[PDB]
Amino acid sequence: YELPEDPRWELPRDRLVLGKPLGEGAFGQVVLAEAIGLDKDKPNRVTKVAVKMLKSDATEKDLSDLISEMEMMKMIGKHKNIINLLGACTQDGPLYVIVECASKGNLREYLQARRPPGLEYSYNPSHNPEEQLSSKDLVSCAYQVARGMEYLASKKCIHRDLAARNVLVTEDNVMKIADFGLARDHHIDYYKKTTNGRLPVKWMAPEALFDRIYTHQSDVWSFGVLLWEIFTLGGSPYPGVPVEELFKLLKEGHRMDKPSNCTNELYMMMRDCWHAVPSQRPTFKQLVEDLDRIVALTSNQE
Ligand SMILES: *CCC(=O)Nc1cc(N2CCN(CC)CC2)ccc1Nc1cc(N(C)C(=O)Nc2c(Cl)c(OC)cc(OC)c2Cl)ncn1
Structure with a gap:
């Protein structure tokens, strides 16, 4: 139902402007968005991003799957030639996992x-x-x-x-x-x-x-x-x-x-x-x- 916070990855919900849908998969729903201040050293820059969240046919297992996908991406770390994790909104609302667009x-x-x-x-x-x-x-x-x-x-x-x-x-x-x-x-x-x-x-x-x-x-x-x-x-x-x-x-x-x-x-x-x-x-x-x-x-x- 409610999740731990990892401060290094946490983005305030007010810093994320959701945009048009990209579609549902087997996984979850994805939407285009604009994120403001993803970097500490650049808090006024908007970055276009993709965001994964659960669909309102809210499955149960799907939440643990979406968490697991985020957590695995944290463990793998960053590389130029993969789609990288940029942030998450985990507190007081639906889980949003934010990645490179x-x-x-x-x-x-x-x-x-x-x-x-x-x-x-x-x-x-x-x-x-x-x-x-x-x-x-x-x-x-x-x-x-x-x-x-x-x-x-x-x-x-x-x-x-x-x-x-x-x-x-x-x-x-x-x-x-x-x-x-x-x-x-x-x-x-x-x-x-x-x-x-x-x-x-x-x-x-x-x-x-x-x-x-x-x-x-x-x-x-x-x-x-x-x-x-x-x-x-x-x-x-x-x-x-x-x-x-x-x-x-x-x-x-x-x-x-x-x-x-x-x-x-x-x-x-x-x-x-x-x-x-x-x-x-x-x-x-x-x-x-x-x-x-x-x-x-x-x-x-x-
Ligand atoms: C920001 C990306 C964007 O602007 N658009 C975009 C469009 C498409 N199209 C596919 C179908 N076409 C119809 C003919 C229209 C164009 C394809 C790709 C992009 N970029 C894009 C898409 C996504 N998606 C959909 C994700 O689900 N991304 C994502 C990934 Cl790859 C991973 O990988 C580990 C994990 C998560 O969440 C945990 C997500 Cl959300 N992403 C990025 N860029």
């Missing part, structure tokens, strides 16, 4: 919107994107996510749904991993789709999917799907493949084709992330180093 949306969308222009044969011939990404920009998205994941892994955090939908992009084009404070924990609805109508099982390592074993190595497999999403500019993995057929593909050792405009080296990295044997996949630390080297050598002229 990433203004350019999720990565899947950010890549889709920057696809090259529509042609005579396209689904969308008048698609004329505002911005375009070079080969270096794409490698650089990959590097930034890997660096975020390396950080999380060093804090003993296993994500368990790494995908472009769960990477967010700031106004400065920084990649931030989202929804890393959660738990699942059971196998949910292997058939439940995402808002965009996709099946999360398509990002899951076979040992997680078949033996419920989730490790840093299973997140590396998901990262390889993410790489494939980046280099297809927000492509959808296994389009038209239902769950039962996906299981069969994995049991046969099937692997996705190399996307066009992907080097053999980046395809090898993908495939190595998709090693059948988890011990043989690269780690996030190695993916960070490799991607750092590749970025430096990748052309920004196309």
Whole structure:
């Protein structure tokens, strides 16, 4: 019913101006807001933020889940390439958990919107994107996510749904991993789709999917799907493949084709992330180093 206070994280309710809803998830409700004086050394500055709170179908467990998500984010600490906790309103009112706002949306969308222009044969011939990404920009998205994941892994955090939908992009084009404070924990609805109508099982390592074993190595497999999403500019993995057929593909050792405009080296990295044997996949630390080297050598002229 009523909560302890942590003074270092506490923001007075009068310092938070709630704004338009962003929507309900399984988790809770989120709203855009403006927070005044988040920093001690800057008490007149307004920061745009996102705020999580319970929905009025107020569940019970959901309160302990929202608390747990906040508390985990406190324990993980701050990193440039994750969505960071900025504050909370815990006293004399509903729990509000306040986090960084990433203004350019999720990565899947950010890549889709920057696809090259529509042609005579396209689904969308008048698609004329505002911005375009070079080969270096794409490698650089990959590097930034890997660096975020390396950080999380060093804090003993296993994500368990790494995908472009769960990477967010700031106004400065920084990649931030989202929804890393959660738990699942059971196998949910292997058939439940995402808002965009996709099946999360398509990002899951076979040992997680078949033996419920989730490790840093299973997140590396998901990262390889993410790489494939980046280099297809927000492509959808296994389009038209239902769950039962996906299981069969994995049991046969099937692997996705190399996307066009992907080097053999980046395809090898993908495939190595998709090693059948988890011990043989690269780690996030190695993916960070490799991607750092590749970025430096990748052309920004196309
Ligand atoms: C401040 C962010 C913003 O301005 N908008 C925003 C919009 C979107 N869109 C998705 C759907 N599009 C329709 C086509 C419209 C654009 C996507 C992302 C952002 N930024 C954003 C969103 C969120 N959300 C929704 C959160 O739930 N954030 C959040 C996270 Cl990631 C985590 O991660 C651990 C934890 C909590 O609470 C504990 C929350 Cl609230 N956040 C940030 N930025």
